[PDB]
Every structure is written in C-alpha cells, then in structure tokens.
C-alpha cells in the first residue's frame, strides 16, 4: 500500500500536465464564442502556458537541490491546482492569460522534480524498473482521459472542464505528503547568474518562435527577440565555466554514449508528439468521430501500452536497452506502414483502426522504459537534478520541431493532389479526398524519421548491469 | 501435365546455372591437389566462367529474335551440358579453362531466353503469375541442392560433381522439346556493329576488374584494359542511336517508373547475393557444420521460400507490387536484425538458426514475385528480348559490387577487435571470437542496404491491373 501510493504520487504531475493540455485544446473553439477574444487571442492562451513552462523549466531542475525535492514537488503541484481554479473564472482575456502563465510556472517547478524523484526515491533494481513503467504509463492516461473529459463536459460549459483538475490535484498532494520522505542532506547554494541567463535565453527563444508566424519571420520583433536569445545563450555558456553547482554541467556530456541517448529522446519525442497530433486530427476531421467518441476509441491504446510497459519492466534486467528499443520500434514501424496503405475514409472500426493502434501501442511501451532508465543512469545525487531537467526539455523540444516539418509536407501535397487551405467543413468531398491522401502520405515521413531514431539507437551500448539490475 | 512440364522446362537453366556455380566453389580446394594449378590458377577457373557469361549476355538477348527463342533455349542448354562433360575430363589447367569458357557461352545464350519465354509463353494473368513463382522457385532449389551434392560426393572425387548436370540437362532438353511451341513470326536481322561492340565492351570490363587485384589496380594492364572498355562503350552508344532492331533500346528507359524498378533489382540482387555468401561462410567457418550438413540444414529455407512464392502469386492480383515488396521485405528485415543480436558461436540449431531462416525465406519469397512481374510489364514481343537480358545483367552485376563492400567491412572490424587475415584453421580461438563478431556486425550493413531498396521501392507505382490480372 505504501509502494503503490509512492509511485502514483511521483507521476501525478505527468497526468495533470498532459491532461490539461488536451482539455485546453478541445475547449478553444467554445472559448471564442463566450469571451470573444478574436483569432489573435486564440493562440495566446496556448503559448502562454508554454512560454513559462519552457522558459522556467531549467530553473526548476536545480531548485530541488537548494530547497528539497519533496517540498518543491508539493509547491509545484499546489500552484498548478490553484491556477486551474482561477483559470475557470476568467472574466476577460486578461485574466485567462495570467491564469495560463501561472500554470506553466507550476508545471515547470514540478515536472523536472517528478522524474528526479524516481531515481532518488527508489534504489536501482526492480524497484526502479516498476516505478519507471508507472511514470510513463500515466502520461498516456492523461492524454486519453483528457479527450473523454474534454469532449464530454463541454456541451454544458468550458469552465467545468478546467475544474476537473482540482479533485485530481488534491489527491496527489495528499499521497505525496503521506508516502514520500524528506532527504536529510545539506542544501546547496543556487547558481544565481547562470540561472537568470538560462531563463532569459529559453523564454526569449520561445517568444520569438511563437510570435514569428503572427508578425512574420522577418518582422523586426521576431529576429529582434532572436537576438536577445543568442546574446543570453552566449553569455550563459561563458559564466557556466566558473559556476559552482552548475545549472547545466556541460562536462557531464562527453563523446560517450550519453549524447547518443540524449539525442535519441530528442528525435524520439518528436516522432511521438507528431504521431498523436496527426492521428487525432485525422480521426476528428476525415472520419468524424467527434471528441467523445475518439477518446473512448483510444482506450485500447492505453491498455495496449500498459502491456508493453509491464513486459518491458521485467525484460530490462536481462536484455540491454539497445535491443529492447529496436525491438519495440520494430513493432511500431510495422504499425505505421499498415496505416499508411489501408487507412482510407469509410473503413470500419474494429478490423482496420483498432489493430494498428494496439500493435503500435505495445511497440511504444516496450521502447519507453529502456530509454528512460538509461537517461538517468550513472549520474548521482548532486547532478540528478539538472540531468533530469535536460532529459524532459529535449523530449518536449523535439515535438514542435518535427511536427512543423510534417505539417508542411501535409499542406504541400494537399494542394498538389487538388485541395484547398481552410476549414474542413467547407469542402466539396473531392477536395476532402485529397486531404485524406495527404495525411496518409505524411505517415510515411514520420516512419522515415523513426528509422533515423533506430539507427542512432545502435550506438547506445549500455549494458543491463548499469541501467538496471543492481 | 502440359502446364507443369512447360513451367519446369522454362526455368531449367536457372537450376543448372545456380547449381554449377555452387558446386565449383565447393570443389576448388581439391582441384589444386590434383591438377596443381597453383594459387594463380585458383581464380581463373571461376573468372573464366564469368568472363564469357557476362560478356555474351547482351548478345543472347537479341539472338532469340533472329533465329528463335525455343531453338535458342535448346541450343544454349545443349552446349552447357556438353561442356560439363568436357570439364569433368580436363587433363590439366589448360583444358579446364576452355571447359569453363564454353559453359559461360552456353549460359549466356540460354539464361536471357529463359526469362523471355516466361513473358511470351504465358498470357498475362493467373498463368503468368504461377509461371513467375516457379521460375524464381527453382533458382533457390538449385542453390541449396548444390551444397548437398557438392558436400555429399565431394569426398570421392570432384569429377563426379560436374557430371551431375548431365542427367538434369538431358531431362530439361526433352521437356522443352515436347512442351514448348515454336512461334511463327518473321525473323529480325541481327545488329552486327552494335552486338560486336557490346561484347567487347562488357568482356574487357569484366577482365579488367578480375585481373586488377592480381596485378594491382594501377598495374598498367588494369587501367590499360579499362581504356579499351571505355573506348568500346562510347562507340557502342554512338552507333546505337541509328540502329535497327537495337540491342539496347535506351529510349525504352525514360523518367517513368521502369528505371525505379530496374534500379531496385540491381541493388536487391546485391543484398540477396551478399546474404547467401556471407551466411554460408559464417556457417561453415564459425559453427563448423561442413558442406553436407549446411546444405541439409538449409532445406527449411526452400520450403519457406516456396510458401512465400505461392502466397504472393495469389495476392499479386489484388494488391499492387509496392505493398507486397514492402510487406515481404519487412519480414526479412526483422529476421536479419534478430540474427545480428542472438547469433553467437555455439548456439543450438532448432530454436536459433532455423526460425530466422524460415521467416527470412517467406519475406524473400513474397517480394521476388511482384518485382519479376513488374520488370516485364508493358514491353511487347519485339522488345522483350533485350529487356529480359538487361534485367538479368543488373541482378548479377549487383552481386559482386555490394559483396565487395560488405567483405571489406567485415575484414576491417576483425582487425579492430583483434584478429588475423588468413585461413581460419590457424586462429587462436580468441582470434576466432573476433571473426564471429565481425560477421554479425557486417549483417547490419546488409540491413542498411535493404532499407535503401525499400525506400526506392516506394516509387514503383504500378497498379495490379498492369503487372498481372488481365
Ligand atoms: C521518449 C522517452 C523520453 C523519456 C524522458 C522522460 C518522460 C517519459 C514519458 C514519456 C511519455 C510518452 C508516451 C505518450 C504518448 C502520447 C500519445 C498518447 O498518450 O495518446 C495517444 C494518441 C491519441 O491522440 P490524442 O487524443 O492524444 O490527440 C490529442 C489531440 O490534441 C486532440 O485533438 O495517439 C495515438 O493513439 C498513438 C497511436 C500510434 C499508432 C500508429 C498509428 C497507426 C495508424 C492509424 C491511422 C491514423 C491515420 C494515419 C496517420 C496520420
Ligand atoms: C530480385 C529478383 C529480380 C528479378 C530477376 C529474375 C530472377 C529471379 C531470381 C531471384 C533469386 C532469389 C531466390 C534465390 C535465393 C538464393 C539463396 C538460397 O536459397 O540459399 C540459402 C542461402 C545460404 O547461402 P548458401 O549456403 O546457398 O551459400 C553457399 C556458399 O556459396 C558456400 O560458400 O541464404 C540463406 O540462408 C537465407 C538467409 C535469410 C535469413 C537471414 C539470416 C538470419 C541469420 C542467421 C545466422 C547467420 C549468421 C549471421 C549473419 C552473418
Ligand atoms: C511518391 C511517394 C510514395 C514517395 C514519398 C516517400 C519518400 C519521398 C519518403 C520516404 C522516406 C522519406 C524520408 C524519411 C525520413 C526523413 C527524415 C527527415 O529527417 C529529419 O531530419 C527529421 C526532421 C527534423 O527533425 O529536422 C528528413 C526527410 C527524410 C529523409 C524523408 C525524405 C523523403 C522520403 C525518402
Ligand atoms: C559501432 C556499432 C556499435 C554501430 C554499428 C555501425 C552503424 C553505425 C552502421 C550500421 C548500419 C550502417 C549503415 C548501413 C548502410 C549504409 C548504406 C551504405 O550504402 C550502401 O550500402 C551502398 C552499397 C553500394 O555500393 O551499392 C552506406 C553506409 C550506411 C549508411 C551505413 C552507415 C553506418 C551504419 C549506420
Ligand atoms: C536501422 C534500424 C535497425 C532501425 C529500426 C527502426 C526503429 O524502429 N527505431 C525506433 C526505436 C524506438 C522508437 C521509440 N518509439 C516511441 C517512443 C520512444 N522511442 C522509435 Br520512434 N524508433 C527499425 C525497426 C526500422
Ligand atoms: C523506407 C522503407 C519503408 C523501407 C522498408 C525496407 C525493406 O524491407 N525493403 C525491401 C523490400 C523487398 C526486398 C526483397 N527481398 C528479396 C528479394 C527481392 N526483394 C528487400 Br531486399 N528490401 C523496410 C521494411 C525497412
């Protein structure tokens, strides 16, 4: 009863953050009709969360070492819960932007500490292997359960959708309080100069990337904010050399296989993120299931992924992470190919749409566990903080980058086959068929990116003794 | 009975050609002990057969039209059969070389006509699909049965090995005589100047490549012969513009998907060729099975190959060649990955060495049939001759090229891990472990080549209406 309570508490922020993002996206169209925030404000509610979530993410990595990882986890989750309540009672656009800024700060504080708690709370061995599976298992639960909740309690009001996090947030705080123990180690002085430059460099980069399309890539404020990011980034590296308790220990990333493992997650995260966002759009637009039905139809993915994580936790003590990652990705590669050849509009559900999802889910579940274990292997307690933060940012950073390329490919072929750029509802059913074949074509590009991840995963070379089995 | 006799007769030369090459390589060591032809003579017996087999191949494409395909086939097999008897009673080195040269001339005339008879004898539809399966099926039966025969009666004398072709050749001549019909059409005059230059251009290039390693790549005769090959090639193309009944119709090869198809066969043949040669060497040297046991152990591959060919023949009329080629290659890709990870020395036979061979066999069987059908699609009768000849040359030419790269990689890593270059009988059993890991490392390189074939097979774009089902 103490072990199940501990694992659930550590992964709580993963469930909340993933679920919040899915619920926010689903409710965007209805927020217009009530607040009337125009198209410009449509994207600000989304970028507002990401502006502070990514800008302050590396600050939260080192924050646990100077304050305490348990007291940082509770504070991060508590602030996130309070922000949801405020977000649900926003009377104008202004209140909603500040409400979303607060959520990003709360997620930035807690998300890196959640992964760092896995390494320190559980000793290396079977305990850590099971904890990692539960950590990754409920990241997918939040995504699917968001679709069900967001698509169900949205025909009454969008405000109630944001209130669903309060019952969940309260439980995780209670479990974390009554299941986690505070380590008795002396606190470490925070890196002042290195931290401010890192926060200023990351936030400026995200602002310029987000505002670029709105104002144009060469507007003047886009590259104008890009200049600050480069100046901030440059200064950050120089003062890191003579930094005590470094925010980013660059010396820790040498020509060894640490770069390979951290490069795989960056591109692997991009493949995963672009795969869910495209599949979600395809189901809603081309097949027209709607939000509630799509969420219920993806329940087998969670069950299928649960099997993959459960099996991989046992095998990770006997096979190296190299073979498991390749073995898991081999099943996923077959799933994408089948969906790229026999996935036209009008097919039934159980024969055609369920099987590739189930097989794809098992393949992903098998490969997630070995990668996470090797990312936090052979670090220690005085550098697990920053290393955990770097692992998650690369996973999050790879999402938008790969997705941008895929969406560009989708649009280009839509016009080639005969198509129109705009809302799907105004389509003559011959332009729609072009959109259907554009999405199927894009699935080949995602598969191509998966091959690169597999190829670069052959260089990892970790043995099962190091990552686990101790 | 009539149909069965026709398909067997047409594919006869594939069985003989593949069996003869496998038997010759096995009996090379003893030909030294009796004839005493020295190390220099070791390669002339092999290169003699390939010098004329590749030199005269393009002349045999257009021979069928000027005299007749049935008569050309019988003449080609007959001269091959007579040469084997003369090869079996060679007095010394000299008599053996002319014995091997004659076999190459006979196989050059009959092999291109064998594939042409498939297109012109069976109308497009289920008949052709079945005929294509048998044509590719007996290529593997000859390969495996060569090892058994070459390892079974090699302990008494190498002269009995070459006489095994005589009983098989005599049956195939009888079947072709009483099962194939002579076509009643007017003959087309043979291209004198174009044919002569092509034989000179191709023969000189093969000679230069073969003798280069012996005398060095910059000896003077190596590049000296290469100049003659280049001079012949340019003269061949210039005259070929104003040629009647052209030997090589370049105009037939345009930017359409014929180049993509013919490019895949060139590289696909290399992957297939390098896979059997390397696997045979690994089995004999590392596992120490011996020739007879290796031949008997590869029987499941033939049965697995037969199942893949049979299934693909039925599916080719419902699914395009693009998906079948990818589907078959996907199974093979998994088989080679498994071998690259769990194929150390001393593993048992049934669980480890059989299953990857069986799975790989089905993958290859599925992919060859769609590729063969698409290679002879949309051609006609007045140009089937040269097109079939080009298909075989590209398949055979891709073998040595890809194999040379793979062998260099295996040799380089053997020294890296600690080993020696030389006979495998004088290794320390620590130097042999390095060789074992080198072979499995090379298998990944073959997988890299296989991926490129799949990537370039996505551009085929033939519908099932064109290649079959008509
Ligand atoms: C990486 C390790 C790092 C460790 C560093 C530390 C961190 C460790 C944890 C990592 C967690 C990653 C796993 C989570 C996966 C995310 C996806 C998910 O949990 O949820 C499922 C999602 C449903 O979508 P959602 O509802 O989430 O969408 C939201 C929209 O925003 C709403 O609109 O996707 C899928 O089902 C995946 C199926 C894939 C199978 C292959 C496809 C076959 C083809 C079928 C036809 C499709 C058309 C063709 C193709 C176009
Ligand atoms: C494309 C056509 C276009 C149309 C053009 C028209 C023409 C069409 C013809 C197409 C030809 C294809 C069929 C014939 C294939 C021939 C291969 C064969 O039927 O024969 C078995 C062979 C063994 O070779 P042999 O014994 O014959 O060689 C003897 C040496 O010569 C002695 O010196 O291959 C295999 O076993 C297959 C292996 C597949 C699975 C992958 C391996 C898994 C790992 C296992 C452990 C190995 C060690 C690790 C790896 C190192
Ligand atoms: C006529 C149709 C059927 C052909 C369409 C398929 C090919 C043109 C696709 C198949 C695989 C694709 C490749 C698959 C993967 C990649 C990885 C991708 O690599 C990345 O750098 C990821 C993006 C990034 O993070 O920058 C670049 C494109 C490329 C080479 C793709 C190029 C286009 C290819 C060859
Ligand atoms: C050191 C260990 C732990 C890693 C294994 C080495 C990998 C880094 C190798 C294995 C697969 C290799 C690739 C496999 C295949 C190719 C195709 C190869 O292209 C050809 O095969 C051309 C053949 C021809 O001449 O026609 C070029 C190298 C490349 C990219 C290889 C690059 C190096 C890779 C990734
Ligand atoms: C050269 C080579 C042998 C490539 C391997 C590719 C692969 O499948 N590579 C792979 C392996 C794992 C993951 C993954 N999937 C989800 C989450 C995290 N990682 C991914 Br995208 N791709 C294939 C099976 C073709
Ligand atoms: C980009 C992409 C989707 C690649 C496909 C590769 C493939 O598997 N490609 C392939 C397909 C067929 C054959 C074959 N095999 C034997 C005889 C004839 N053809 C071969 Br070598 N490779 C994989 C399954 C990774």
UniProtKB/Swiss-Prot annotation, chains A, B:
InterPro entries: MFS, MFS_dom, MFS_trans_sf
Keywords noted in UniProt: Cell membrane, Membrane, Transmembrane, Transmembrane helix, Transport
Any Gene Ontology CC annotation: membrane
Intracellular or extracellular location(s): Cell membrane
UniProt keyword Magnesium present: no
Induction: Expressed during infection of macrophages. Down-regulated by the nucleoid-associated protein Lsr2.
Protein name according to UniProt: Uncharacterized MFS-type transporter EfpA
UniProt organism field: Mycobacterium tuberculosis (strain ATCC 25618 / H37Rv)
């Amino acid at each position: 009863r103490s072990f199940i309570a501990a694992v659930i508490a550590i992964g709580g922020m993963q469930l909340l953050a993933t679920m919040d993002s899915t619920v926010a996206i689903v409710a965007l169209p209805k927020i217009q009709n009530e607040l009337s925030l125009s198209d410009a404000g449509r994207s600000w509610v989304i970028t507002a969360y990401v502006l502070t979530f990514g800008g302050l993410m590396l600050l939260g990595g080192r924050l646990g070492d100077t304050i305490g990882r348990k007291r940082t986890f509770i504070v991060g989750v508590a602030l996130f819960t309070i922000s949801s309540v405020l977000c649900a009672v926003a009377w104008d656009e202004a209140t909603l932007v500040i409400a979303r800024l607060s959520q990003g700060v709360g997620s930035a504080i807690a998300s890196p500490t959640g992964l760092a708690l896995v390494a320190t709370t559980f000793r290396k061995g079977p305990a850590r292997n099971a904890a990692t599976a539960v950590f990754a298992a409920m990241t997918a639960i939040g995504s699917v359960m968001g679709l069900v909740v967001g698509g169900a309690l949205t025909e009454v009001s969008w405000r109630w959708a944001f209130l669903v996090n309060v019952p969940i947030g309260l439980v995780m705080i209670y479990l974390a309080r009554t299941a986690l123990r505070e380590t008795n180690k002396e606190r470490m002085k925070l890196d002042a100069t290195g931290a401010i430059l890192a926060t200023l460099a990351c936030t400026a980069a995200v602002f310029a990337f987000s505002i670029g399309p709105e104002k144009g890539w060469m507007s003047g404020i886009t590259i104008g904010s890009g200049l600050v990011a480069l100046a901030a980034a440059v200064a950050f590296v120089i003062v890191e050399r003579t930094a005590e308790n470094p925010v980013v220990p660059f010396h820790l990333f040498r020509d060894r296989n640490r770069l390979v493992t951290f490069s795989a997650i960056l591109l692997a995260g991009g493949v995963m993120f672009s795969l869910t966002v495209c599949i979600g759009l395809y189901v809603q637009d081309i097949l027209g299931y709607s939000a509630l039905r799509a969420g219920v139809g993806f329940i087998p993915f969670v069950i299928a992924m649960g099997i993959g994580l459960g099996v991989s936790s046992q095998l990770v003590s006997r096979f190296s992470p190299r073979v498991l990652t390749i073995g898991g990705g081999y099943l996923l590669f077959g799933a994408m190919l089948y969906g790229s050849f026999f996935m036209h509009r009008g097919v039934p559900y159980f024969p055609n749409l369920v099987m590739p999802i189930v097989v794809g889910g098992i393949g992903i579940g098998m490969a997630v566990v070995p990668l996470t274990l090797s990312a936090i292997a052979g670090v220690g307690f005085d550098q697990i903080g920053p290393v955990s933060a770097i692992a998650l940012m690369l996973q999050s950073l790879g999402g938008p980058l790969v997705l941008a390329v895929i969406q560009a490919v989708i649009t280009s072929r839509t016009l080639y086959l005969g198509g129109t750029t705009g809302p799907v509802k105004f389509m003559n059913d011959v332009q729609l068929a072009a959109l259907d074949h554009a999405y199927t074509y894009g699935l080949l590009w995602v598969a191509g990116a998966a091959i690169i991840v597999g190829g670069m995963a052959l260089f990892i070379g970790y043995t099962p003794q190091q990552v686990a089995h101790a």
